[PDB]
Design a protein around this motif. Structure first.
Motif, PDB file in Angstrom:
ATOM      1  N   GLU E  50      86.833 -52.573  62.830  1.00  0.00           N
ATOM      2  CA  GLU E  50      88.600 -52.565  63.336  1.00  0.00           C
ATOM      3  C   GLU E  50      89.040 -51.428  61.968  1.00  0.00           C
ATOM      4  O   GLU E  50      88.486 -50.993  61.255  1.00  0.00           O
ATOM      5  CB  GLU E  50      88.846 -54.021  63.463  1.00  0.00           C
ATOM      6  CG  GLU E  50      88.928 -54.476  64.373  1.00  0.00           C
ATOM      7  CD  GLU E  50      89.545 -56.273  64.101  1.00  0.00           C
ATOM      8  OE1 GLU E  50      88.619 -56.865  64.579  1.00  0.00           O
ATOM      9  OE2 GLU E  50      90.740 -55.645  63.970  1.00  0.00           O
ATOM     10  N   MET E  52      92.478 -51.907  59.716  1.00  0.00           N
ATOM     11  CA  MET E  52      92.697 -52.438  59.261  1.00  0.00           C
ATOM     12  C   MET E  52      94.768 -51.916  58.662  1.00  0.00           C
ATOM     13  O   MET E  52      95.513 -52.623  59.022  1.00  0.00           O
ATOM     14  CB  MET E  52      92.145 -52.269  57.912  1.00  0.00           C
ATOM     15  CG  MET E  52      91.283 -53.064  57.032  1.00  0.00           C
ATOM     16  SD  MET E  52      90.483 -55.073  58.163  1.00  0.00           S
ATOM     17  CE  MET E  52      91.928 -55.556  56.636  1.00  0.00           C
ATOM     18  N   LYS E 156      91.515 -61.694  54.604  1.00  0.00           N
ATOM     19  CA  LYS E 156      90.034 -62.568  55.228  1.00  0.00           C
ATOM     20  C   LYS E 156      89.867 -61.897  56.511  1.00  0.00           C
ATOM     21  O   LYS E 156      88.377 -62.516  56.617  1.00  0.00           O
ATOM     22  CB  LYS E 156      91.526 -63.262  55.955  1.00  0.00           C
ATOM     23  CG  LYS E 156      90.669 -64.863  56.996  1.00  0.00           C
ATOM     24  CD  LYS E 156      92.144 -65.671  58.010  1.00  0.00           C
ATOM     25  CE  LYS E 156      93.539 -66.136  57.141  1.00  0.00           C
ATOM     26  NZ  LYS E 156      92.578 -67.523  56.341  1.00  0.00           N
ATOM     27  N   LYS E 157      89.749 -60.983  56.662  1.00  0.00           N
ATOM     28  CA  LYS E 157      89.242 -60.275  57.612  1.00  0.00           C
ATOM     29  C   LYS E 157      87.660 -59.777  56.683  1.00  0.00           C
ATOM     30  O   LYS E 157      86.687 -59.979  57.476  1.00  0.00           O
ATOM     31  CB  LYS E 157      89.441 -58.306  58.273  1.00  0.00           C
ATOM     32  CG  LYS E 157      90.706 -59.160  59.246  1.00  0.00           C
ATOM     33  CD  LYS E 157      91.341 -57.231  60.180  1.00  0.00           C
ATOM     34  CE  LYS E 157      89.784 -57.153  61.116  1.00  0.00           C
ATOM     35  NZ  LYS E 157      89.669 -57.804  61.758  1.00  0.00           N
ATOM     36  N   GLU E 160      85.415 -62.962  55.888  1.00  0.00           N
ATOM     37  CA  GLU E 160      85.087 -63.375  58.342  1.00  0.00           C
ATOM     38  C   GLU E 160      83.974 -61.738  58.530  1.00  0.00           C
ATOM     39  O   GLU E 160      83.030 -62.723  58.785  1.00  0.00           O
ATOM     40  CB  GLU E 160      85.787 -62.846  59.181  1.00  0.00           C
ATOM     41  CG  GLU E 160      85.757 -63.598  60.195  1.00  0.00           C
ATOM     42  CD  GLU E 160      85.472 -65.313  60.534  1.00  0.00           C
ATOM     43  OE1 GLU E 160      85.654 -65.777  59.257  1.00  0.00           O
ATOM     44  OE2 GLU E 160      85.108 -65.531  61.626  1.00  0.00           O
TER      45      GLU E 160
END
Lengths: 83, 121, 129, 207, 223
Positions: E50, E52, E156-157, E160
């Motif tokens: 992904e 950011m 947090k990404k 995770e």
RNA sequence: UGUUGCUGUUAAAGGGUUCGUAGUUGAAUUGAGGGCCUCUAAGGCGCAAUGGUUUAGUCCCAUCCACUUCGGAUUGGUGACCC
């Protein structure tokens, strides 16, 4: 070596190499840590295929502790002989 | 005038891959070049071949610089030859070795001692 | 001037174990410094050591491994009790796994595990990882 | 050796060579790297290098170069004229690759290029000319063997062999030795006889 | 996809089945310089990408400005792989691509342990660590089961995707510069194999690099 | 607002220098015992003794080459060393 459960099952992804000069650890993002191989030798003066190995690490080489290390390891095996 | 890098580059490649010239003639050299290369300009062929000659003239002296190490190889193959016979390490020992104090000191304390033909000033 | 003898040991030892030294010198000496090393030396953090005599104040020498990361003193020598320990372990140590805190208890100089076991509190002294 | 057979230890002829051709004569200058290998000096202040420990390091070096699976994973580097022959000659006997002339940055760290190489060993001849190459070996995990003087930086030099490097003779003889003692161990040119190639091939000849 | 022809010793060995994991790579600590080596040795439908951050950048010139887009991309797997990379382009879709590619060459493994009793599978880092990039710094703290990720959005990404569940965190510095925030949190995770614990030390037997072992291959390939 | 836990070269902040009372802080030392009985107890680089046939290697003998650069032999001596 590495972390276990209480079932004895090993949970570490891999177990990394040592430095033999200073007993540190050899990280994946360090590209200055190396491995040398010195071939073992019989009577008459021929090769038997390699045995002994050293490991040196990033920290040492840029401070020029390199040479001093390789001495103080080799002498311990009996590869290098002090007069 | 000044020669573009098309010229230079090309010319180098030839000097390398051929020593079916070594001539300092523009003329002899030229008639090699034009049957070895395809460029489809006759102008280029002149300048290339001309520069070639001005490499071979330099090559007969010291290092040309930036054109392989093959130069050393074919320079070694000449005359003569090479130069003896028994040499050099032989001559050197056999005619005496002379040395200053400190060296001689250190040598005699070794497990081979001070060897034959050595040495004091 | 020279105030704490103890922290003038453990600061030296720490630094040197980073800098790649295999031995250290420790210039003043105490009846405290000795003991603190004896602890560590059990586990394997400290390999051996010597104690040199000068008939004024001693010197000490230390050997090293690579298995020690940091050591130090907690200077005012605060107080601890039977529940209290978990404060210090959540704080100074990075984990409740491999660290140790060092204490001076009624029984003598010890390390936190041993303390809790025998049910003494006491003052505190230093730490090592 | 291990279970000592008392080969690979100095004999008369060894000493004789290294004295004569001035491989024990160093620079006046000093550095904290080299002070172990220095042994006394003269009124000129010319440091004199130990023979014994030169030899030990030299042996050690050979045992690296002939450990290798394929000779072409060794490269030999120099930049200086007097050595720029003996590079070639050494490489042609042992079977190694080499890099001659000025060192081009982008020959070990560039992904996609005309010259890209990934050797498992290296040799310089001085770390004070060849500097650029040392840097690039920091990042590719390549251990470096080096000849040195009584000065030398040792940053990114794993194995240091003290030598002279100040004249034709000095550079030649070191490579000559190394070529000998690699062949003896591997593929058995015998050490019963003297070796048959003569020095002078290695020697720089003026144009 | 347009095809791969390897220019590296490493790359050859990967493109046939010799090196079958990234942990062989990680061990001997060889650099990865072809993105296709991460594609090959990690199964598809298990990578999570992904973006950011995407952000404009200018420079001043005569007549006006000049504009270049930029982007950050993060990639990895829940078994303990993660990387990050950021790059630049003069169009949008450019910077996007170039980020993703970059990210897959900074893959690094991540170590996990326990807070307490050793049961199940590791859910938390074994120790406290730090990272610093710019002024902004980040600290990661172990935590027990079910504590969960207590962190800002940005960190947090990172956590995770790594495969770190329960944790806690804290920061100092200007945390509103996002590029540095990311890279801080990344440098944090790295150092869990950078620290030496009684779980290990044993002076393990060491092994030869794949290059040595498989040298047969690489010689034929030269010809 | 920082006891845990901040900052003071250039972003706000070391007071012109020194002496000096209250206050805070302050080096080392009396010292941590042995004996005996066992358990596969981890080590001795301490010692007696039998086993080495290039079936380990190295010193000291023997003999011939040899001007750098030779090796066959007497379990040479359980000097030494494994086991």
């Amino acid at each position: 070596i590495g972390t276990y459960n209480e079932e004895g099952v090993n949970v570490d992804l891999y177990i990394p190499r040592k430095c033999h000069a200073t007993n540190n650890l050899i990280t994946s993002y360090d590209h200055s840590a190396v491995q040398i191989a010195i071939a073992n030798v019989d009577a008459n003066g021929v090769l038997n295929g390699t045995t002994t190995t050293f490991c040196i690490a990033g920290y040492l080489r840029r401070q020029a502790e390199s040479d001093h290390a390789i001495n103080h390891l080799a002498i311990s095996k009996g590869i290098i002989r002090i007069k | 005038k000044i020669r573009t890098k098309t010229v230079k580059r090309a010319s180098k490649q030839l000097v390398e891959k051929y020593f079916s010239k070594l001539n300092k003639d523009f003329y002899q050299n030229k008639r090699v070049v034009m049957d070895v290369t395809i460029a489809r300009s006759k102008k280029l062929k002149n300048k290339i071949a001309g520069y070639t000659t001005h490499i071979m003239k330099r090559l007969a002296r010291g290092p040309v610089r930036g054109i392989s190490l093959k130069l050393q190889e074919e320079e070694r193959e000449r005359r003569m030859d090479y130069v003896p016979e028994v040499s050099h390490v032989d001559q050197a020992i056999q005619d005496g070795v002379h040395v200053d104090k400190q060296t001689f000191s250190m040598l005699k304390r070794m497990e081979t001692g001070v060897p034959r033909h050595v040495a004091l000033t | 001037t020279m105030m704490s003898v103890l922290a003038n040991a453990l600061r030296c030892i720490a630094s040197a174990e980073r800098r790649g030294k295999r031995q250290v010198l420790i210039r003043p000496s105490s009846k405290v410094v000795v003991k603190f090393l004896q602890v560590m030396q059990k586990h394997g953090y400290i390999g051996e050591f010597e104690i040199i005599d000068d008939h004024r104040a001693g010197k000490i020498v230390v050997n090293l491994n690579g298995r020690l990361n940091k050591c130090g003193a907690i200077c005012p020598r605060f107080d601890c009790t039977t529940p209290d320990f978990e404060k210090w372990v959540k704080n100074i140590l990075p984990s409740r796994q491999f660290g140790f805190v060092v204490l001076t208890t009624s029984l003598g100089i010890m390390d936190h595990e041993e303390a809790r076991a025998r049910n003494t509190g006491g003052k505190v002294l230093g730490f090592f990882y | 050796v291990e279970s000592g057979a008392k080969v690979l230890r100095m004999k008369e002829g060894d000493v004789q060579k290294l004295v004569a051709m001035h491989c024990h004569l160093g620079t006046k200058n000093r550095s904290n790297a080299m002070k172990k290998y220095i042994h006394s000096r003269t009124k000129e202040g010319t440091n004199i290098i130990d023979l014994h420990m030169t030899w030990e390091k030299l042996i050690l070096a050979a045992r690296v170069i002939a450990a290798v699976e394929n000779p072409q994973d060794v490269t030999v580097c120099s930049t200086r004229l007097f050595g720029q022959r003996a590079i070639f000659k050494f490489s042609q006997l042992v079977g190694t690759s080499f890099l001659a002339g000025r060192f081009i940055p982008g020959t070990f760290t560039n992904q996609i290029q005309k010259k890209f190489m990934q050797p498992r060993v290296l040799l310089v001849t001085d770390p004070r000319t060849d500097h650029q190459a040392l840097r690039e070996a920091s990042l590719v995990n390549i251990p470096v063997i080096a000849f040195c003087d009584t000065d030398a930086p040792l940053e990114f030099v794993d194995i240091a062999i003290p030598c002279n490097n100040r004249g034709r003779y000095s550079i030649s003889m070191m490579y000559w030795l190394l070529a000998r003692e690699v062949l003896r161990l591997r593929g058995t040119i015998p050490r019963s006889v003297p070796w048959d190639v003569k020095v002078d091939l290695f020697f720089y000849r003026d144009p | 996809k347009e095809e791969w022809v390897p220019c590296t010793k490493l790359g050859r060995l990967v493109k046939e089945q010799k090196i079958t994991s990234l942990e062989e790579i990680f061990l001997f600590s060889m650099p990865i310089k072809e993105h296709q080596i991460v594609d090959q040795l990690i199964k598809e439908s298990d990578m999570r990408d992904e973006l950011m951050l995407i952000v404009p950048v200018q420079k001043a010139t005569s007549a006006g400005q000049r504009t270049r887009f930029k982007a950050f991309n993060i990639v990895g797997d829940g078994n303990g792989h993660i990387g990050v990379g950021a790059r630049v382009g003069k169009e949008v879709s450019l910077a996007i691509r170039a980020s993703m590619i970059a990210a897959k060459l900074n893959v690094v493994p991540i170590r996990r342990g326990y807070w307490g009793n050793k049961i199940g599978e590791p859910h938390t880092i074994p120790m406290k660590v730090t990272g610093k990039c710019g002024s902004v710094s980040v600290r990661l703290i172990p935590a027990p089961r079910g504590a969960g990720i207590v962190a800002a959005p940005v960190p947090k990404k990172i956590l995770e995707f790594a495969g770190v569940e329960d944790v806690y965190t804290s920061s100092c510095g200007n945390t509103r510069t996002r590029g540095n925030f990311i890279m801080a949190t990344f440098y944090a995770l790295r150092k869990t194999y950078g620290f030496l614990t009684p779980d290990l030390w044993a002076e393990t037997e060491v092994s030869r690099d794949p290059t040595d072992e498989h040298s047969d291959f690489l010689t034929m390939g030269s010809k």
